A paper describes a structure:
For the TRPC4-CaM complex, we added a 10-fold molar excess of CaM to tetrameric TRPC4 in the presence of 10 mM calcium chloride throughout the purification process after detergent extraction. The CaM complex sample yielded a 3.3 Å map with applied C4 symmetry. 13% of the TRPC4 channels had one CaM-bound, 35% and 31% had two or three bound, respectively and only 20% were fully saturated. Based on the flexibly fitted atomic model we observed that CaM not only binds to the tip of the rib helix (residues 691–703) and the following loop (residues 677–690) that connects the rib helix with a newly identified helix (residues 666–676), but it also interacts with the adjoining loop region comprising residues 273–277. The core region of CaM binds to TRPC4 by forming hydrophobic interactions, while the peripheral residues of CaM are stabilized by hydrophilic interactions that are typically observed in CaM-protein/peptide complexes. Interestingly, when CaM binds to TRPC4 the selectivity filter is slightly widened and contains a density that likely corresponds to Ca2+ or Na+ as in the case of the inhibitor-bound channel. We observed a much stronger density at the Ca2+ binding site in the VSL domain for the CaM-bound structure compared to apo TRPC4, presumably due to the high Ca2+ concentration we used for preparing the CaM-TRPC4 complex. There, CaM binding stabilizes a longer stretch (residues 677–692) of TRPC4 that is highly flexible in the apo state of the channel. Therefore, binding of CaM to this region of TRPC4 likely reduces the overall flexibility of the channel, fixing it in its closed state. Since one TRPC4 tetramer can bind up to four CaMs, this suggests that the number of CaMs simultaneously bound to TRPC4 could fine tune the level of channel activity.
Here we report five cryo-EM structures of TRPC4 in its apo form and in complex with the inhibitors GFB-8438, GFB-9289, and GFB-8749, as well as CaM. Within the TRPC1/4/5 sub-group, TRPC4 and TRPC5 share the highest sequence identity of 70%. Both proteins can form homo-tetrameric channels that allow the passage of Ca2+, but also Na+ ions to a lesser extent. The architecture is typical for the canonical TRP channel family with a transmembrane region (TM domain) where the pore region of one protomer domain-swaps with the voltage-sensor-like (VSL) domain of another. The cytosolic domain harboring the ankyrin repeat (AR) embraces the coiled coil helix in the center and the N-terminal ankyrin domain is associated with the TM domain via a helical linker domain.
Author numbering:
A (entry chain A): 186 to 277, 283 to 753
B (entry chain C): 28 to 118, 136 to 172, 186 to 272, 284 to 660, 696 to 753
C (entry chain D): 28 to 92
Write the structure that this text describes.
Amino acid sequence: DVDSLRHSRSRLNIYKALASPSLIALSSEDPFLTAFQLSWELQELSKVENEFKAEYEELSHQCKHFAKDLLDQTRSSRELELILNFRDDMNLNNELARLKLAIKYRQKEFVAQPNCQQLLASRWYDEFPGWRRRHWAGKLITCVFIGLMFPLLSLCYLVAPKSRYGLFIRKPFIKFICHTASYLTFLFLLLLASQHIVSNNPDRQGPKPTTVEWMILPWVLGFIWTEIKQMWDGGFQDYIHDWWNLMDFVMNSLYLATISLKIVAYVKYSGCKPRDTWEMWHPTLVAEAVFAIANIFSSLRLISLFTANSHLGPLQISLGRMLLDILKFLFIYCLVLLAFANGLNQLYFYYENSEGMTCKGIRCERQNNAFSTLFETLQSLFWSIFGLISLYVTNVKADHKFTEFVGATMFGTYNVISLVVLLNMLIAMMNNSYQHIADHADIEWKFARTKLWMSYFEEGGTLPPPFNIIPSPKSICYLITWIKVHVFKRRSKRTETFGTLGRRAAENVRLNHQYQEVLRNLVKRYVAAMIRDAKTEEGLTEENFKELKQDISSFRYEVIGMM
Amino acid sequence: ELSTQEKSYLSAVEKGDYASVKLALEEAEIYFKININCIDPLGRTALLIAIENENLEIIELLLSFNVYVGDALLHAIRKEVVGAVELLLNHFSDFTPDITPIILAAHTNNYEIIKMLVQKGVSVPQPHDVDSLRHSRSRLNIYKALASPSLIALSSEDPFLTAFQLSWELQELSKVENEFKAEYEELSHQCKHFAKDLLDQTRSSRELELILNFRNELARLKLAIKYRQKEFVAQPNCQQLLASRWYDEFPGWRRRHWAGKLITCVFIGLMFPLLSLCYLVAPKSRYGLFIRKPFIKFICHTASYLTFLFLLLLASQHIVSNNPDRQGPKPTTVEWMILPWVLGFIWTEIKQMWDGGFQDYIHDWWNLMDFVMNSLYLATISLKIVAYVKYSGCKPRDTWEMWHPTLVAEAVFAIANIFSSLRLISLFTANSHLGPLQISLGRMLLDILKFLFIYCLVLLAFANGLNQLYFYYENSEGMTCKGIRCERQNNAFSTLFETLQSLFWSIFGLISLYVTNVKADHKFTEFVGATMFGTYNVISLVVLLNMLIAMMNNSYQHIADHADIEWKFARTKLWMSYFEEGGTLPPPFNIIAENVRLNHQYQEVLRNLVKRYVAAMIRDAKTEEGLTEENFKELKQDISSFRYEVIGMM
Amino acid sequence: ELSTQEKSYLSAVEKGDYASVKLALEEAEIYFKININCIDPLGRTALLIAIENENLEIIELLLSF
Ligand SMILES: CCCCCC(=O)OC[C@H](COP(=O)(O)O)OC(=O)CCCCC
Ligand SMILES: CCCCCC(=O)OC[C@H](COP(=O)(O)O)OC(=O)CCCCC
Ligand SMILES: CCCCCC(=O)OC[C@H](COP(=O)(O)O)OC(=O)CCCCC
Ligand SMILES: [Ca+2]
Ligand SMILES: [Ca+2]
């Protein structure tokens, strides 16, 4: 293509052609899948073009509305379950395959449909009807009961999930309650890991794990194993796509580093040393610091559960969807900080001033040598945005009053830029950002809530992390066979394991015909509700006036002619 | 499924040729080579098209020729073509199976159609499965049908109560569906304006008095306050009645200027004792019936509050306080005079809780502070009398033991001082300038508790962290006052409760640095400790507060267009608490054919009142709505059916 | 509050049919079986319909009878 606008216009015209609802009804033997792949195409191509991004995003949103409006035309729960439960067999049920596909395409306005959400809600509370008698304390007591009850409620499923109570945790909401209860017990053990009622002697290099640490360790392994399990099904494709997933990955890496540093301390520490005499950069200290940071991340990570609660849900979503703006603006803030740090170091480079300043640094009792090196200047310029820095850091141990004046002026310019210019700009930016992320704060929240629900729908990691590492009843029959993949036992899986006739197509064919009939009815209803609600419901333009005028005029002329 | 012989016939209907269509029907019977009830390629029965173009001339022909009617009624009803309905009445589907002509006619809100069906005897199945969305749809299709203004005007003898009980149902049934919530506020807030729009038809103060004073005085308004009908009381001419009743004794109070309003209020404010004692002893004719006037009682009531606090201002002065060092001191003189108000407020509180049964008492976010306001006074009195027995030694306060009954008593009284001084804010609901501001300042208070939930939890996240690092450095041996509130900020991150403290005070920049230092050279431990501290301010101080500003700012906008109607509901709910002659005494002086004729007189008001609404609703919506293509396509068919007739006869 | 001999009369005013309406007002005098100034069920006077359709041709007729 030597020219470019002809080709670009041709491509946009093509997409805008087969993105029309009317054409999808005629062609497109599978309108849902068509709209889905088409929205994906245009969303991923609105960045490749990047000059027509408005048009392509508009078209993708239009076909998303088409998918939602086509799902809307269902008239019976039977008609809905087939739509949500459908997928290509290819000889490979009812586990909401179409809905998971819709999640996979970021079709967030298709899963916010009312009756679809009703189906999911019904399938979430299967253990017990109602959940509408609940109130401020009615729901709390039944959830607190299970949150206390999860140990043996989990053990029952572990050993005897036949008929008594193993199916009671398999149910999704109970699984959620048990998981969040396990997380809360983890956090309780973490808070209690700092009390002196259990802590080991501080004056002991590389001590053996304390009993609380012994209890904590199975949670560490459980979280590591569940994150490896989650990785082994998304293949670092959606794994990185979830920012919560990145946060918990770094948390588990910090836990791994903590275990390694603790044990490598234990192999050679010999103990019996006061903490005030420990050499800097000792494995126990760094292990403790990493453990603390991991505690911070762990206690933060429960924010994700607030997507389930119908009150912190949208608020947490809006929190998430203006974090990008704060990152963009914080990059500029960091650039300005580096600039002023450069200058301030240039100025107070020579006044080293460490003859009597005991414990030199910004973080002293006197804030001395704040600008005497690049690191301390970076750090001092950070703290000044909070006011925790004082003046007289700009003073020097001499009568060089002009140097002090220009340094104070540079520091004041930095403060005016940050706390009066930049921070106010940040506020005025997120004000309009929130003003433009409230129109779809509900639909997007419901999409996130569905994403959280479907994680607990499947019969996968049904076991909370404390009772997850516990080996399966076999435990030596699945790991080995999956380990027999680099040898001849990889091919001994599709010859002797399967020897039957594979009698499934006759069910598959009837299922597909039933789904096709449902699609045919939905499409006919959508057409009959798009002609009668959009064609005859728009405005009256000048052209229609002209047509009516000319109809009258032709009438007059012909009746004149006939006499 | 297409052909060619009827595509002219199907278009002969659409053009509107009476002659050609009549011939095609005639040839249909003899030579069955054409389907009378054909289907358009887009899908429209020959009758279904004549319905759309409102042609009664050819609807007659199709109806007279045994055409398949099908759901043509349901389609005519949706298109609100009145002329076609009489023809159809007197003789796979698009709509949901549960929809019936009366249910769908109420959806369109068309009086002419609705009145015509109800005479035929149609009935609306009143509200109360294995399948979910045939119930939730049908239930919403019922409620939206019987929440329609036009249907309520025909059935539902008492339109006001019907718009009241119903609006309660939808409001309390949105929270149970929780997913059709938007589709239900669309209905509850639709019938909340029906009440206001029917009450506006009143054309005299007489016809207004009957509405409110029906099942004495202001019978119905006491009820609409219960149903949170806040768009019904804010009606202006109704609010005019209240103000003319809230300034009852003395006329005017419009001529008085800025300073004129003030002299005559403070002057009553300084006569509150004598204006209450006169009612206390003899409310015969002189002044005991002056307090009974709603305004004056408010001023006396408000005056008492001010005076009450005034002692709280006095109770802390050294001139009236007792000796500093007195184990369980005897009550001081001002405290003794304080005591009547404490009992005064409790007595009216128990009276308030008696008429609400804790279900209406708990609803106000005021009585939740009023309760703790009083309940901390029992903890004030009980502690002092406990300190008055088995504790009297006149011992210097330095050596007093912690948790001593007086110290608990003094603090718990101090806290109750705040919960009382802040409680006069509710008296600002009356001031027209601080009224809308205060009510709109509390309508987004919830959107701050919802957000100090996160900051209460992020604060736990780092307190979990910084403790886990520093807790091996206690150092609470050398530096006296091993706490945070000291001159030299000792070991702020030492215990869990000290780090909950240390982090909280950091949001105000009150926690200096070097609290992150340690009494050693572990410059890594300090640094990571300082980093955790620093990144806490970034998340909270500059990112969480900023998203709190950016969130109330939006939340304010949704509560601004109704920041006035809400306020007059808060004011009326404050006025009406003084209208009734109940607790009509300030706290310190507090402890010391009968209805058949009325009914048939009130029924004649509603019958005119509703008739005054319908005749003033069609002139405002049925002849004032926008213009759409479906009307334009009618005029073409209106002329084509006329040119094909004038030419056809020549 | 309905009838039959007026519903065509009221429609004739609504349809603008000046031809039929003059007959009813001319046939009313001989046989008082039709209410000239009646009210339709929705509530609109016969003459008020002509006021509503801005049709001067029958307004002059109505006021004339
Ligand atoms: C944008 C950079 C402004 C200069 C900042 C500065 O440090 O100069 C302050 C000067 C002198 O104060 P210092 O130099 O800070 O000691 O005083 C003013 O001019 C106040 C003007 C107040 C202006 C808000
Ligand atoms: C935000 C929760 C922080 C809890 C930290 C803490 O335990 O200290 C209590 C803090 C300050 O009291 P100190 O313990 O002395 O720090 O008071 C409040 O939180 C008032 C909030 C009332 C808000 C209306
Ligand atoms: C927004 C200013 C960023 C500039 C970075 C900088 O000055 O150095 C980082 C400093 C490191 O030095 P400390 O103040 O000791 O933590 O603080 C942070 O880590 C906060 C970043 C955490 C932000 C989430
Ligand atoms: Ca994860
Ligand atoms: Ca009270």
